[PDB]
Amino acid sequence: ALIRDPRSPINVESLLDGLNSLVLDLDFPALRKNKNIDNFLNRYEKIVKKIRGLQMKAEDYDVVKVIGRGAFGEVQLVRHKASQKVYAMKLLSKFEMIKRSDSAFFWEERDIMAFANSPWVVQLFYAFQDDRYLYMVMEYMPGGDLVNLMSNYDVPEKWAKFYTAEVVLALDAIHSMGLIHRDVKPDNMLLDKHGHLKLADFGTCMKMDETGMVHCDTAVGTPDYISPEVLKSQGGDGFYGRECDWWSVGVFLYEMLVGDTPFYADSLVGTYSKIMDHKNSLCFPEDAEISKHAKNLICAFLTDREVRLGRNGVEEIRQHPFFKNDQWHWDNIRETAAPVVPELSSDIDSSNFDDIEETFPIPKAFVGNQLPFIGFTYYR
Numbered sequence: 001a002l003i004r005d006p007r008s009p010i011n012v013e014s015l016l017d018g019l020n021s022l023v024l025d026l027d028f029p030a031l032r033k034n035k036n037i038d039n040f041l042n043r044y045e046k047i048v049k050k051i052r053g054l055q056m057k058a059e060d061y062d063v064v065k066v067i068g069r070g071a072f073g074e075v076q077l078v079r080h081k082a083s084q085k086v087y088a089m090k091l092l093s094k095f096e097m098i099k100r101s102d103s104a105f106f107w108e109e110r111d112i113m114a115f116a117n118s119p120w121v122v123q124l125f126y127a128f129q130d131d132r133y134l135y136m137v138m139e140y141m142p143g144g145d146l147v148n149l150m151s152n153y154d155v156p157e158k159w160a161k162f163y164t165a166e167v168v169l170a171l172d173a174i175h176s177m178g179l180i181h182r183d184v185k186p187d188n189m190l191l192d193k194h195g196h197l198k199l200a201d202f203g204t205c206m207k208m209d210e211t212g213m214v215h216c217d218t219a220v221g222t223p224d225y226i227s228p229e230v231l232k233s234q235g236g237d238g239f240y241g242r243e244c245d246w247w248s249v250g251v252f253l254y255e256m257l258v259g260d261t262p263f264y265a266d267s268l269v270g271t272y273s274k275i276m277d278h279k280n281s282l283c284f285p286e287d288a289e290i291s292k293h294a295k296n297l298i299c300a301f302l303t304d305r306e307v308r309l310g311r312n313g314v315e316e317i318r319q320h321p322f323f324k325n326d327q328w329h330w331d332n333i334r335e336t337a338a339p340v341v342p343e344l345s346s347d348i349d350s351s352n353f354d355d356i357e358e359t360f361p362i363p364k365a366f367v368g369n370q371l372p373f374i375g376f377t378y379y380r
């Protein structure tokens with residue numbers, strides 16, 4: 001009965017993952033001296049290779065261009081050969097994830113994009129694997145990200161109101177699924193064909209307790225955007241709530257209106273120290289020319305959690321005077337016209353993206369390197 005459920009760990013895709021993964025981890029001359037291992041391989045090695053050809057696989061896609069990179073892989077603009085549809089495909093290297101003891105962040109990332117069913121969340125259509133990579137096949141966002149937008153325009157406060165509102169709604173939606181994002185930044189804010197925002201890169205997300213809190217002893221995210229409480233949790237037993245995402249919205253709003261990040265330093269350790277000393281290090285440039293309302297919202301986000309705007313819920317963010325505007329309302333913003341509408345040449349126009357510039361050793365005994373990746377495959 002669970003076999004049909006796309007959420008169950010024992011659906012057909014996961015059962016096939018196990019059989020495929022066992023053959024992968026055993027098929028070596030050394031391990032084949034065990035008769036058990038050889039008797040199984042003989043029975044199943046021909047049909048597994050047949051199954052491999054009929055399963056969704058990488059060679060079914062044309063690689064048009066590489067449009068993104070990360071610690072463990074890259075994102076490619078692809079076209080599915082048979083259907084001629086266009087997607088963005090993210091790859092995660094199995095060797096690197098094992099080599100750097102980081103093998104479990106992709107579960108929530110896959111599940112959010114697959115099941116959120118939200119206009120604010122990039123949607124996942126397929127997940128598959130081969131012996132080297134994980135693959136997440138996603139709806140393509142041809143508008144680019146907000147780093148690219150900020151590098152090409154001087155963002156007036158009217159635009160900043162729009163993108164900050166859309167981010168607030170997107171984070172609220174993620175919070176209502178029980179998740180804290182923890183890596184809010186402009187590189188994770190993607191724009192669709194109509195210029196509206198979606199969140200991406202859910203690698204550092206975490207589900208909250210029945211109390212709304214998370215225990216964590218590890219500081220995560222990006223150094224420019226990390227909140228004091230998350231940073232402080234590296235020294236043991238962090239207990240914090242969703243409000244760490246609102247701190248990172250404050251950094252984003254500063255960066256859009258001022259042109260630099262508010263805790264900039266030449267060293268990572270300097271950035272870490274400035275964030276700790278934020279009550280003294282947060283300083284707007286003399287030539288800023290930023291409104292009183294914008295400066296008040298920025299400073300209401302860039303405080304300690306016990307005092308931070310949003311600690312009581314999103315309604316206190318939405319009423320803030322900075323969001324007074326003559327173009328949109330909180331309940332209809334994504335159906336109004338975005339400030340920048342992309343002009344697109346073809347369905348593989350990638351002009352809003354800058355251009356971009358090892359394996360396991362053969363085992364002596366059973367290691368099970370493919371075991372952590374069982375159950376990743378998903379067919380919509």
Ligand SMILES: CNC(=O)c1cccc(Cn2ccc3cc(-c4cn[nH]c4C(F)(F)F)ccc3c2=O)c1
Nearest residue numbers: 068069070071072073074088139140141200201203
């Ligand atoms: C631990 N995490 C990693 O190692 C890691 C590996 C690879 C990339 C990243 C960060 N990154 C960058 C771009 C990116 C782009 C899309 C996306 C979806 N639809 N369209 C696009 C478009 F590309 F068009 F913008 C979706 C996710 C990402 C994304 O995650 C992180």
